[PDB]
Ligand binder design. Sequence first.
Ligand SMILES: Nc1ncnc2c1ncn2[C@@H]1O[C@H](COP(=O)(O)OP(=O)(O)O)[C@@H](O)[C@H]1O
Ligand SMILES: Nc1ncnc2c1ncn2[C@@H]1O[C@H](COP(=O)(O)OP(=O)(O)O)[C@@H](O)[C@H]1O
Lengths: 436, 228, 28, 443, 222, 418
Amino acid sequence: KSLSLIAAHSHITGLGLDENLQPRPTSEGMVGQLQARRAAGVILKMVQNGTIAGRAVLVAGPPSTGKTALAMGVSQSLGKDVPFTAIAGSEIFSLELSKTEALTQAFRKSIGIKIKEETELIEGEVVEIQIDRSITGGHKQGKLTIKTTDMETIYELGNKMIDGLTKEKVLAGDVISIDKASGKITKLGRSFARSRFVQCPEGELQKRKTVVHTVSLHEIDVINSRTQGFLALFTGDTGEIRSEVRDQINTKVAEWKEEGKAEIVPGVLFIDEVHMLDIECFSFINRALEDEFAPIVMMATNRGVSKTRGTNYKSPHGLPLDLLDRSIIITTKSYNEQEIKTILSIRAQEEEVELSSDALDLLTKTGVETSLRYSSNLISVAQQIAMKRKNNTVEVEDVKRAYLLFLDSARSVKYVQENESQYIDDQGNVQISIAK
Amino acid sequence: KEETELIEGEVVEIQIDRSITGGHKQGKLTIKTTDMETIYELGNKMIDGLTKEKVLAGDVISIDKASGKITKLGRSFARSRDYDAMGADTRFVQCPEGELQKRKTVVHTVSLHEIDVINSRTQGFLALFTGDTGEIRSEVRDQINTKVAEWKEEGKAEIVPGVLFIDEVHMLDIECFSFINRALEDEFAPIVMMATNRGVSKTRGTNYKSPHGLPLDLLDRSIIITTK
Amino acid sequence: FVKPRRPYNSEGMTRILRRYEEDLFCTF
Amino acid sequence: VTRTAAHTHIKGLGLDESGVAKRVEGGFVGQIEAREACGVIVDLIKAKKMSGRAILLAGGPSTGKTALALAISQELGPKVPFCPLVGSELYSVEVKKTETLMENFRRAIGLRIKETKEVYEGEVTELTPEDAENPLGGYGKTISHVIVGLKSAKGTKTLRLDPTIYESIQREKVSIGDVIYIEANTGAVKRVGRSDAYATEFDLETEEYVPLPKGEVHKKKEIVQDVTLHDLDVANARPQGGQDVISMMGQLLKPKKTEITEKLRQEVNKVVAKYIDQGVAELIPGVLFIDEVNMLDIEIFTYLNKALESNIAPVVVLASNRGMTTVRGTEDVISPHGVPPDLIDRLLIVRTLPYDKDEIRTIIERRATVERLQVESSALDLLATMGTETSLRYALQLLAPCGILAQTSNRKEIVVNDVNEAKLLFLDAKRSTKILETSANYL
Amino acid sequence: RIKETKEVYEGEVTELTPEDAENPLGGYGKTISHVIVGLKSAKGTKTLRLDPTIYESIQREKVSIGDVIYIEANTGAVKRVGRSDAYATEFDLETEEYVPLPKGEVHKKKEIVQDVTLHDLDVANARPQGGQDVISMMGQLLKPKKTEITEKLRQEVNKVVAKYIDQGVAELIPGVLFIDEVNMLDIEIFTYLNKALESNIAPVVVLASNRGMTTVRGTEDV
Amino acid sequence: IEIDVLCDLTQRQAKLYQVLKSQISTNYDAIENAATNDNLINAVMQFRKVCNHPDLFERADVDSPFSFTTFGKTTSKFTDLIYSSRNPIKYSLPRLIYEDLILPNYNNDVDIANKLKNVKFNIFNPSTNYELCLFLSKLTGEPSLNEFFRVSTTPLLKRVIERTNGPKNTDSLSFKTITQELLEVTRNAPSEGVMASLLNVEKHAYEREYLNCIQRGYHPNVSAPPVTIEVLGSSHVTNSINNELFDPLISQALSDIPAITQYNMHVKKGIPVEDFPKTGLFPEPLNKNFSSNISMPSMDRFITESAKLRKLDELLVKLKSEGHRVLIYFQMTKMMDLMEEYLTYRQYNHIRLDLVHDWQTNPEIFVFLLSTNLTAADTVIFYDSDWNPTIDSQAMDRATRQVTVYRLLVRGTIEERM
Ligand SMILES: Nc1ncnc2c1ncn2[C@@H]1O[C@H](COP(=O)(O)OP(=O)(O)O)[C@@H](O)[C@H]1O
Ligand SMILES: Nc1ncnc2c1ncn2[C@@H]1O[C@H](COP(=O)(O)OP(=O)(O)O)[C@@H](O)[C@H]1O
């Protein structure tokens, strides 16, 4: 289930918070940023209450300060059965959708409908099967014996049951699940009978089971549109769906909530690097946030007063002032030495690397000096140098060897800046020959 | 390298069996030379090539098995009772004598691009002429590279490299040059000849001036022939 | 020994015969 | 005898068991620290625990970055999927560059599955269909069942078929006396050829003649296949292989690139995880290599920043030869090697160094001995002075005209005079530029 | 310029009798030995002996007595031109094409000179011929989007065209391609004109312009 | 007379060689030292196995795409074979969306709006727009005025499937172009005509380049059926899905009817051929090799895939022409039944497994297989050659005329160091 090697945010299991929304110094893989974690907990409670809609927040700060860490903490704290869409700023620039249509699809993918239905099922272990044919073979008669750990029974089979059991061949000792109303029968496995392997089912053979479904508004939008079927949810060619089916889906969902057959579960849309959208996308975002079915939008950006895309002026955070007028801004701060060493110790624990105290202090010093991500990349690559000399713990010599072998930004710029005749410049001028 | 068989002789009896609709076609053909006379079995393409270019009894035809080509050489029987439906004036040829079935080895050359277009989709031979081969995937080209080397190892096929000539190469983007600089290092790469009648001018796609309109990375891996 | 030929089954099918002296066409 | 092109004298990094690089091993000369860093990267890839790791090969031109990437791919072996790429490959006219980048990312992850196939095979003996009671009722097909009799080596089985398998059987144009191959996983039918039990010299379709298959008619055999995740995504996005009419018409349509949604990728990942959990499939992460990373746009870098945070991303290797270069798609962002600073923080830069005179001389020695050419000592010293004076590559690719001019004089040895004629016939960039400056009308 | 000699057999159908064989084969019915078809035209009447395979073409195109037909000599392949004018008042209400009885003899030899251009040959050889596949008729029922015709098809067209000139059958007539206001052309089209003017099959091209010392489009200094 | 024969590595053998080189952490110096000395022995038998024959380390089998299916498999007088291939990916849809958006009932207006938008307000309806129908009938020449309303309301695949070549009246605004005029001449035209040969470039390029004898080079890696949609508790969903996937008109159009069945329709039931469901719409593939994605193991790649076996096949022709009796020396038994398979394919006289008596009395036997006094033996061949004199000396001591020993070696492996 959900295969993964090691992620860069794999230690963040959620927001470390109390019952009074207070951030602990070290909980759930998150350390530091107390006010930002408290604000994200307030936003989490805003999502979990579900009584308000279409509020946009902004996470702005210096790079490598844990904005994506905060977004992953909120996403893990939401848990399952709540929609969470995470897109980047370059994803909406499509060749077969418009930008407003892609933003609309991302908006409607973040809100879902919870529908509870019950289906009666039969699941047990097959004991013995008789298939009887007549002289001409026109009529087929059959008997099936199926049991659980608590009962045993014999069923008289009709013709379509016989054709459904002859197809996808079921033998004795096979554990199967039978849906009567749809005719679909699935083989669960084989029973533990030496004389895959699944145990025998228990309880009553005929169970009424309740399954809770969650379907987004974009799925019903795709199915309700007659131009393309449900296979466009996987192939990805929806192709500029009209607004009329959206209005019908809105009215149908409203009357379903009014009747009580279905509930609305709103979610979070996370936009990462929001500064690289055009001003048309921003203008669409201003007027898409006052709809009743609009999720809570999270944007993360790290720029200063820079040029907004598609314009010729400069704006704070790369966003226009009317977009920033409808936003509440959470600001993240840079880290200290203790927080950097705690982050590096947590990354050591997640990467199964045993570190000495002096190696950890050297990593902390070179992380304060250059970058946190540089140390978090060096810690995993020092373990292979340690394993080349056949010892388990990573010592100082391995970290110094990794620091010598792999450079960082500042040393690379320093090495380039007095060797620029060997590199291609802005004018395409380079010197290849060693002499002259 | 391909191995084929040639069959030539007079036609004695053509039997063609077809369905009511006309899809399934099968039959037998009795061909005959001076010394031998055998009866063969026909297929759908055989009957299709027999129906067009109408063959009757007494005509002399040549059959190529590997190409599926039917050529009528003429007529020899000179049938008296002819129904006057056509104005055929077929030539009077002699009786072929000797072996009915002769084996020969033929050689034909195909390009690599034609193999990728043929193996790309179901009707690629149409797209070879219409030019509708839109962005063939890389896994295809890997599999044709493997099979071409395998055909080299069996002795069936060999690679004859050629020359790619690009006139007015300075009318190219810088991404084309960046692709050429790494596509020249492949195993299946021809010898590329480029021609330029330009001095130090603007390189397309950027905002600097370069010799011959080409960046220095492309000029690094090129020997230059000058003209006077 | 001589290997036997493949069996030929043409049932419920038409026939076109083109011999030296006459040409036939059997139809259902 | 063999065919060579600017490479294939490189057989690997050529390290020791402790990771220390020798001076001349595997066709490599020099670049010791770069080779040691690449060996540590090979060990990290072989560890198979890390995702989204990015290194960068920074240096001047003609320093051996593509050679080092080829050494990485040769050291890892053919089992690990290696996906070479240029920066200009991502600009496609059918789909956006973001989906092309994610297609390459999912193409760089391998998989190895052992698959069980249910196979019916044999020689067709009896082929008899049965008719329906009402064929012009429209609903339901013309036939009801088709009886097929198959025989093998010591075995004979009679099958009763539903019509849908018989449509495939008819589409392969089988007859009585043919050897067929039916698999039950997808209903695909393969027709092998005519049986050898009948006469083989009375045909006109140049068909092969196979004997009867061994074993029973009904088998279960194990097949080990090697696929990528991108093959699963493409096969699920454009479904071909079923016997329904949608997959039947999916083969006849012209193929195109669509935007694969994240739902299909998540479901493919879930099915692959279930395959791995049963001990059937194993996961082989690979290497994605991008040549000329300065040609990428700012949008592609910004999508790389989020694509490297995924949990299934492979190890990505970039190469660049740029100093302080403005990033494409921007007007003022001056950054090292043309790579924006948001990607540099997630990068481990490996620096390549320029060569020397003796290294140029011995590199020309390996390139001459891999091209089956023998040169003299004085001509070799002349070529080394050429490599220091003009270019390493100009000295490298001047060997073949020297060999041609040696062969046309009925000699085997390359002498100084052949190198002088190679000077007189072929020029380099500097002499051509000097001709261009002192020219009347852009000569 | 292509010249061709056509042999035809046209006129009103007088009789249509599939003649049976002397010894019919078992398991079959109405084994045709030959087909007797009588023709009627203006100042001409001729009965014909036909191949037995022409009966399938008679049955396919629904040819009855009184219809006027058009028989190609070598290919067979009869076709219904229409119904004769003498049967126009046969029924009260009938949706049937009525056409005049053709003039001249039933049998004639006519030399037909036909004029086509090379682009017509290219677009006719490029599209797939009349078949039973879904793709051909589906493309016939859709929007005819143009495609980049490859140089291989043009090369084979030139090869077969030269082969039929050297037999003395066909004749090549070059013409004039006149482009006026060539100031609007981009420099890429100028370079492709430079490439294309060196071809062997190229006609004469006439250009017109009304500019003086102006920059070429696509360049900022020329 | 002692000579050795060198062979070059194949592509497959080089690939398993590179896999074995990269797998055991590149201790090639230790591998060479262990070969020079003679669990590195278990390492070097794998290299010797790869250098001997690739089918011993990994047997070649049927090359087919990976089947991304969950079908009904057997966990082991006729046997039923029913198509049951599904897709592992399941899309779950609640019953409420289906029953309240797609199926008509009393509380929705699906059928009312469908009729309102398709029949009452259609502009091709002759009951309300007769002038437009008459205008279009003058324009096109359709004999029926309901043709446009029928064309506009049925799907495209249904339109192309049942399209009939009905006649059109001459008095209309549309006649035939020049290209179609050239087209209708060459429908059944034979060769050697100028107009037929000028319109048949593609078939000439087909038979000029011998395209009906070329081989397939690409097959896809994964083949999958369409994604299954699951709705629990509804038979209408199953009926609609089975009707959409297996529509009888499109399925019957892409295949053909058997000939004896057509004889039963036309003669034994009196059904005319115009009332037949029309068939033969599938496009014919390029070769017979291009009709499938399954490639059989051929008995030609087995010879070429081993360099020693290919060189032995090349060498055996000369000893067959000169009439010799050759000894093959082995070390293992997997190569014993491999050479039994190869010699039964080549149909050569070889021993079945006394040996000395059969060797002396019978001279018809060609090749004798032995694993580690024969006076009339002329040629001994060391396939998997070993350089220990205590076995080689008794090998040529065990077996009048001139005696030549042949050793087959592979370039660029342990045998060149050996
Ligand atoms: N408070 C924190 N707790 C745990 N990890 C953190 C914290 N802040 C930053 N990190 C780590 O720093 C690394 C890089 O930070 P990131 O969030 O990518 O920077 P940015 O916010 O600029 O995107 C991530 O792997 C993240 O886990
Ligand atoms: N260490 C080396 N040993 C042998 N040959 C080398 C070495 N480094 C570079 N070369 C040769 O020099 C050429 C440099 O090409 P390449 O590496 O593609 O350019 P760059 O160095 O700019 O990446 C290659 O063809 C390679 O054969």
